[PDB]
Amino acid sequence: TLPDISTFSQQQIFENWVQNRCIGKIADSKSLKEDADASAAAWLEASNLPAENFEKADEVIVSLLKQKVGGTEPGHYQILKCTLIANSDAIRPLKSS
Amino acid sequence: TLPDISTFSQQQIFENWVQNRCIGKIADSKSLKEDADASAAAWLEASNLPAENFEKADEVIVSLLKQKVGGTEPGHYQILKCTLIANSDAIRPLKSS
Amino acid sequence: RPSFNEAWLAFRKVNHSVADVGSIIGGNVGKNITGGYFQNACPIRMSYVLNATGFPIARNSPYAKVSGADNKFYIYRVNDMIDYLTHTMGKPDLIVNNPKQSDFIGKKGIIVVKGHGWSNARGHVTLWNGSICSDQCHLLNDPDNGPFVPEVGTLWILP
Amino acid sequence: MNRPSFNEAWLAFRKVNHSVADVGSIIGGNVGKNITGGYFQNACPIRMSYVLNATGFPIARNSPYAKVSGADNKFYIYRVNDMIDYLTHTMGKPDLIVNNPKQSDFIGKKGIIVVKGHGWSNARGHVTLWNGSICSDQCHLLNDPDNGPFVPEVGTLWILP
């Protein structure tokens, strides 16, 4: 009743790796960080990109997280930010080999 | 920079509302629930769908979260599970009116 | 157009946190607020003003709406609320780029401030009494904008 | 020749039969770096890679599979799917293929066993050594107490001498 990972496109697999890892960086739980990095490693397994790309992507993530995205309310909007980082101009050249 | 919410597709805007909300439901932090919810709100503003859809989709999220997603690590893979839920069969019919 | 004094007093009744505004309006508005689906009360407050001063939002507006316990309709999207003001009152009285308070000195009414920087809202809709706002205005030089930078301000004067 | 010998293989495996963090310390280099950074979590194909690199059947530098290098400047395939494909590309037809595999089906034979199946969202299956009675780690054949949600559908075996 959930879709297999393999039924996503390669671009989507890479985007989801980025989104997941990003969620790992903003989590405070040890529990949630572990869940996040195991989740990301599934996506990595399904991808056809070399490991270097993923390393670079982590760098980009670390940089784009220091961006402030705000709204009409208190909040940090980090979860949104992760979704945006995953689909960012900076991340896009890493979806190719 | 980061891409605007408006540069996504209505489908993607909906999927991301679901994923953001789902992260909210799985967090054990209260500021992460608050973050998730503000984020999800941002996707709801840009969506063209009726509120009622988001209500039904919340129902489907609650249901699908019970589902077990395993792997070679001992964790529950909730982060992965959220992305899967956003792209599930059960959520698709709610992308329209 | 609703009279200003009434608009202003009515606005005071919903000038609280979203949670509160939900408790107050109840119905499906309160259901969605309780659910955490609605987080921005700006368009809901403006809906409340309109409804409580004899200019209630028509059931068949081409804008996304939802009912309260009073069985009146409340728009939950700032984008819709904004378009609604032009759809319903027509041309505005004032339109100013880089909007400052001085641009609206000596005029009362409904103010919309559009700009970039907020991810969940293209702008803010509130009341303006000739020097101060119902809650925050978010004009240029205002200290509580944060990431928000106002690009244009538009005023529909109220009698 | 073409395939490593069983006792060698079983020993090299003993050397990497530890936590993935340890595997990273041991191999170091880029393998280590990726393990420390959290990029690789499943060390199964790393270990099988190590076993092949330590028994004189090194993964070629130009092999059409995703690999990174260790301190030893040798090459480690990091994806289970690529590891499994590599076995068939590099050793030829297996000696045994079995649907719904359990231990009894592989009795009296020994070598590299592959178990494919569903339930693991990060792995199409498992690659390990089999000595005719037990595996060098866990077999994940039918009813293995460490399967979890993993249901094994096919087991295949290349005999090692």
Author numbering:
A (entry chain I), B (entry chain P): 20 to 116
C (entry chain H): 3 to 161
D (entry chain A): 1 to 161
Relevant lines from the article:
The type VI secretion system (T6SS) is a novel multi-subunit needle-like apparatus and plays an important role in many processes of bacterial life cycles, such as interspecies competition, biofilm formation and virulence-related processes. Meanwhile, to protect itself from accidental injury, the cognate immunity proteins were produced to protect the donor cells against the toxic effectors. Tae4 (type VI amidase effector 4) and Tai4 (type VI amidase immunity 4) are T6SS effector-immunity pairs from the fourth family.
The results indicate that the active complex is a heterotetramer in solution, consisting of a Tai4 homodimer [named subunit I (cyan) and subunit II (orange)] binding two Tae4 molecules, consistent with the status of the Ec- and StTae4-Tai4 complexes in solution. The four heterotetramers in the asymmetric unit are likely the result of crystal packing, and represent no significant biological relevance. It is worth to note that the conserved residues Cys41 and Cys101, located in α2 and α5 respectively, form a DSB to stabilize the super helical conformation during the inhibition process, where there is no DSB formed between the two residues in the former EcTai4. The total buried surface area in the interface of EcTai4 dimer with one StTae4 monomer is 895 Å2, with 641 Å2 contributed by two helices (α3 and α5) from StTae4 with two helices (α3 and α4) from EcTai4 subunit I, and 254 Å2 contributed by the lid loop from StTae4 interacting with the protruding loop from the neighboring EcTai4 subunit II.
